Amino acid sequence: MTEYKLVVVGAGGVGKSALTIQLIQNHFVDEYDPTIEDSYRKQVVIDGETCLLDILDTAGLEEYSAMRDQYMRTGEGFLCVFAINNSKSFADINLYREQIKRVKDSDDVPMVLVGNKCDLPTRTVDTKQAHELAKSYGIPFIETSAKTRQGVEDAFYTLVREIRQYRMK
């Protein structure tokens, strides 16, 4: 059974942990519990193959921006998360992507852009803005809500598909 090392990154509070806990535990809590570092494992079937997802949930707290190199070298694919009601988190996306490409020394790193919190009415990042950023990276863009579960499986599973294609090229 093939294992995939996924890493969830993005600005603090965008919903990295809410998304991961919704995938793993099938529930959502509104309390804020900022992450130090957490790891999870989940077996899934994607396109008829059994996959084992090893998921690293990372800290968004910008104070520790200098301590990402090691997990970026180890990770095989990245869920790059912003919140659709937080324009600064959307600007932060490009810094994460540049850091990952810098650290892995490659323009060709499996990634998915995730715009989370789409259940909210107070959108400040329009969907066209995000689609064009993702198009310019050559990567998928998926809108999600960890609160309603909209798009949650699709985001993680698409990233697995991106890693799969990178390996079978």
Place this chain on the structure above:
Amino acid sequence: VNPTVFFDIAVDGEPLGRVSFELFADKVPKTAENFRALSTGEKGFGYKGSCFHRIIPGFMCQGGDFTRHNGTGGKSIYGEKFEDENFILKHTGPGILSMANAGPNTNGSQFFICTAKTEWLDGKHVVFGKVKEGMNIVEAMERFGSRNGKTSKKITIADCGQLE
């Protein structure tokens, strides 16, 4: 005179020992008074019975969530949260007692005790006390921690209050 408070620490309900703290009321009176009142329980709520939910060897022991008991709660005697009083005191070494927070001006009841110098927290967390007696108790708590802070035994404030 600066007040002194104590915690009696237990591990899975078995006593470990007493830690006492000097509270720097002379430098941060509002922050020291919050911690003092929560240690006596005199408002009808406070630290007694709560746990150290995050222990990271080499860095700190963090506790004080007596409202949700999951690391996300707590409240001050002034309301849910209160402002950063000042940043005069620094995280100089083991035994420093300082406020946890969710960013600027979000002090509640959660606190941390340093087990090393943590100078990058200077100007971000309000230092307001230090361990006076029982630093070896804090050192003994570290082995129940882990890299990300999850504890392997339940570390509780079995009793607490103010010393004369």
